[PDB]
Design a protein around this ligand. Structure first.
Ligand SMILES: Nc1c([N+](=O)[O-])ncn1[C@@H]1O[C@H](COP(=O)(O)O)[C@@H](O)[C@H]1O
Ligand SMILES: Nc1c([N+](=O)[O-])ncn1[C@@H]1O[C@H](COP(=O)(O)O)[C@@H](O)[C@H]1O
Ligand SMILES: Nc1c([N+](=O)[O-])ncn1[C@@H]1O[C@H](COP(=O)(O)O)[C@@H](O)[C@H]1O
Ligand SMILES: Nc1c([N+](=O)[O-])ncn1[C@@H]1O[C@H](COP(=O)(O)O)[C@@H](O)[C@H]1O
Ligand SMILES: Nc1c([N+](=O)[O-])ncn1[C@@H]1O[C@H](COP(=O)(O)O)[C@@H](O)[C@H]1O
Ligand SMILES: Nc1c([N+](=O)[O-])ncn1[C@@H]1O[C@H](COP(=O)(O)O)[C@@H](O)[C@H]1O
Ligand SMILES: Nc1c([N+](=O)[O-])ncn1[C@@H]1O[C@H](COP(=O)(O)O)[C@@H](O)[C@H]1O
Ligand SMILES: Nc1c([N+](=O)[O-])ncn1[C@@H]1O[C@H](COP(=O)(O)O)[C@@H](O)[C@H]1O
Lengths: 162, 162, 162, 162, 162, 162, 162, 162
């Protein structure tokens, strides 16, 4: 597996399952793990330190509220980190988004949309990255995009059949 | 020193100097250090792990933007952590505030106002905490508050002298 | 009891019960009372004035909307005040958060997350403060944190059993 | 004087001077005082308790950030309170506005615009209230409004003279 | 009737009924009418022009979204106008609040909280205004406030009976 | 003139001059006038009522803060109204934008960007509308757009000459 | 058909159906199509390029989140474009609104309210535009507006019958 | 060059120069071009269509306000796109951020911080991606990060020399 999907809590799985779905569709081997900067800080450090050796080329990290997980991983590895802001209850993911995207100069995290759209798109982006060097994966992405496009094109009128 | 003041960058000093000022006024010994979760992650872990042994009873941490520093310290010590959101340029500290205050259940950070007001108030709160067991410090806080109150009371009319 | 939990309305109890829960778990004696700056202003003043004599070393105060209760207590005692922003209907606690955290220089309130996460974390922070001088309580916090960490570590994969 | 203008700090005078200006224009006797819920809580209570006896029929209160002053006065008198949110630095008065307008059922504060527009309009509203029973003041307001209207009507084209 | 309650739509009644409730409780005669600046502009002008002659001393106006009704009434009468921001669906009354409170210098509207709290408080404020010259109404407000206070004081503990 | 540019205050001219500029460039005859819903309500009604007879086919209206002008014109004429939110000081035109765009069903206002970009674009949109039936104007818009495009295309590299 | 209604997804139809409703009421022939800048970019370009030839004089475009559809159409035709921000889940259409209204100088989109109110108002505005040159349509709009006004006027009291 | 830096306007260069700086530091060959979805739509399509053939493995795109450029490129190529929100005047890049990050499922853009921090971090992320397969570049990133870390570690005390 060349991609790891991690998240701050098991309660984030309802969101992050949409990243894993994309990888099943595109036949991308992936790791899935609950890793919390706040509740499991030492495992976070260990996970981030061993990511390259473990063969990860992209890491997708999701968290809600004061969403530190993606940034703290990015601080401890040169493996590209993609951040998914989970939709929090009070602030509807604005807290998650700001906590993730607003990284200082030197430690980037590529941030996707709040919520399930973002989880899916994080997997698609990870796939696009891997596809630069994986021609079979490149073809499969190409095919999947064409399928999305064609479905829309085949159904131009949203109204009831008549 | 029973209090440590730390911050994510030397550029935060313009703000965090107002915390140190309060400690000079109240004669509270304190440590001051640049500690970054993002740029110096290992030192953050070491600092947090050794805080109790080093004699710290309150930690004041300030950072801007994706402000992870206070929360990451709080994840690694039981010493109370107080967070100061530094006023960021684009988002005027809303990013800092959300990144600090919105901690998940289990790892608290007591958050103060955005900016220099918050830095001062973090020192005052740290002092109030210490004062529960330090009667001389308690008296000095009491005296300082009375001085603030009396100044306002002595100057009820904001208009020009006439 | 060395901690008081107060709130602006009985309707805040749905939130503030999560602070009291933490104290039951950690065996921390505590007081619970509805105290409103707006509806019971004189009792607020009396409560704040008598807090030290009554043996309180931390006060946790929660309120929604124009959330003045924590700050008004803090104006009238040197006992540390922790503020919990209750999640209001229209503004989802942004009004509560701003009303609490944005205190002027001289009168601090250590603010926690909007909602039930914040109520819990306020109790945990109060506990961390008390634990500086209460070794048995310190051990119990330590044990509780390890239990949270270990649960996450013991359940790394959020997916269905297979 | 049937109106009192109060504010949380002398630094608020730059804003609240625009309320006093309106009263000078309309020849309305008024009191001006720095009264802080946070720095002078006891004077706040005394001021609010004695407002009716002192002859006040409207109170205009201004404050910035965690702006508790108007609401705390309103909690302690039946004299109508009008609130002016001062434009704070970080949050540009959104904190002031929310802290003032979002009062719970039972204790109203009539809130005006953030900043100097609001200070002026608070005085005008206070004047409109008083004018219900003061025919000479009613005429003077009427005349002042006509003067504003006529100035605009007399200058329909904003372009340079030609 | 010395107070009129108006609103932009019949759909606002769910909110504005809480203003009328207060007047029933305090025995304040009042008028209730749907008046829209957008859908009935001419009636708005007629209503505002005839308000003084019709005996109104306070007008309470409520509207949602682009909430122009209160301000447009205030532009056309010297009778004090109080504005109630109705909680809109998308923006949860932030649009309503801004549209109402942010009036330019010369034309004030005293704004209350978003939603049903605001509707009630608008009636209470209108009552406080009228009470300056209506001693029987003043007593009734005083009694009602004491009843609210006493209820809270009589029920200090929010927990289940035991 | 088939287009009128109006604004709530002469202070809005700094912004609305960018609409007039576009009309000078495209040789579109236009009217310019300060018309305020708040300060000149009767003239607003008269202006809106006579717009069709006066030959206006688009009206561009700009205002800041509680920006009622565009919507109140739209309530009183079937001539299409385009709204320009002026950038207010405290809220940076969010108040202006919400006050303009959030119109209820039945009375539309086509809203453009906050500030000078919006003023220009309002004139361009008005021009596009008129161009549907004015072939010479259509050509001139076409030419102006090509000029903008070509300038960008002719300068692909933003770096210093070397 | 002189108006086209397009939208980024079939899921937007729940909103955009309220635009089509207005056209049915006013007997305005219209086209309806799902056109996505993101999922069908080439069809977007083709649609925009052929709009004038196809007889469209107004285009109404709706989309949610990162709502690029209206602006990308406007970049590729001189036919006036009206934008409808669909109410997104996390951000309640603030993302949609900003993505649509905040167009740079040169490429306007006339933006309506978030959600179903906006969809209706976009159709009404399109109709007002067309009505400048379509006297029968002008009469029908006039009649429809009078019907809305009269309904409100005929039902001034929102209370229960008695 | 395996990376292209593009932006909506020459006025964005003040921001995007910080991306190019990182590439100069790390000796990464790169292309720089003004490409606008709004002002040069056809060139955008051509650029995106030819990106893979032209040898680009990452594209960094920056734009302000209604920031469509990154997303429209991402719609037309499988080459990973990274988005930089430029800090707009009115909304301080919140419009830019929302327009970029909130992409629907299927078309991702990895978004970085508002402003110059984001531009730098976009280049660093692009570099991290390329470094997965470029060992010399990997070493250079590693060295650069160590240099940043060491500088902070070498300067722990922000206070004046004494
Ligand atoms: N932000 C965060 C981190 N962290 O940054 O490491 N760990 C958990 N959290 C968040 O707390 C939220 C609540 O988790 P829980 O209390 O429901 O387990 C989740 O969205 C999770 O991602
Ligand atoms: N958030 C953060 C962390 N961190 O959380 O560890 N370290 C630095 N930063 C922030 O980046 C900001 C910019 O720092 P600099 O780039 O000016 O050094 C500071 O406000 C600093 O606190
Ligand atoms: N803010 C406030 C204060 N105060 O600051 O003292 N007292 C009650 N409130 C708030 O009104 C809200 C509504 O209370 P109720 O009207 O449901 O009793 C509660 O969240 C409560 O904390
Ligand atoms: N909010 C508040 C209160 N209070 O509510 O009582 N007292 C002062 N403040 C505010 O602190 C701000 C800063 O005051 P200062 O620190 O510059 O004196 C002022 O805008 C003032 O109104
Ligand atoms: N803002 C406004 C005005 N106006 O300002 O005059 N008239 C109705 N409205 C608002 O449209 C909203 C929707 O009304 P309706 O479409 O449900 O009848 C209401 O909250 C109402 O106050
Ligand atoms: N909103 C408004 C209206 N109105 O809606 O009719 N009239 C003036 N205003 C606004 O007050 C602002 C301040 O005007 P002034 O006080 O500087 O003359 C302007 O942006 C103007 O458009
Ligand atoms: N913004 C956007 C574009 N585009 O701008 O072209 N296409 C679809 N979308 C949006 O994605 C949202 C989710 O669509 P879907 O994933 O439910 O099909 C819709 O509101 C749609 O308008
Ligand atoms: N958003 C946008 C696009 N587009 O998305 O293609 N093109 C230019 N813009 C933006 O307009 C802003 C103003 O450009 P200008 O008017 O100063 O040339 C820039 O930040 C630019 O990125």
């Amino acid at each position: 597996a060349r991609v790891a999907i991690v998240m701050g809590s098991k309660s984030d799985w309802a969101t992050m399952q949409f990243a894993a779905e994309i990888f099943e569709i595109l036949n991308v081997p992936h790791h899935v793990e609950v890793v919390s900067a706040h509740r499991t800080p030492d495992k976070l450090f260990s996970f981030a330190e061993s990511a390259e050796e473990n063969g990860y080329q992209v890491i997708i990290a999701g968290a809600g509220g004061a969403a530190h997980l993606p940034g703290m991983i990015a601080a401890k590895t040169l493996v590209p980190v993609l951040g998914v802001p989970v939709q929090s209850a009070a602030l509807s993911g604005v807290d998650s988004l700001y906590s993730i995207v607003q990284m200082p100069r030197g430690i980037p995290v590529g941030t996707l949309a709040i919520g399930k759209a973002g989880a899916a798109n994080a997997a698609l982006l990870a796939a696009q990255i891997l596809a630069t060097h994986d021609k079979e994966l490149h073809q499969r992405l190409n095919d999947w995009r064409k399928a999305q496009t064609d479905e829309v094109l085949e159904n131009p009128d949203p109204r009831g059949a008549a």
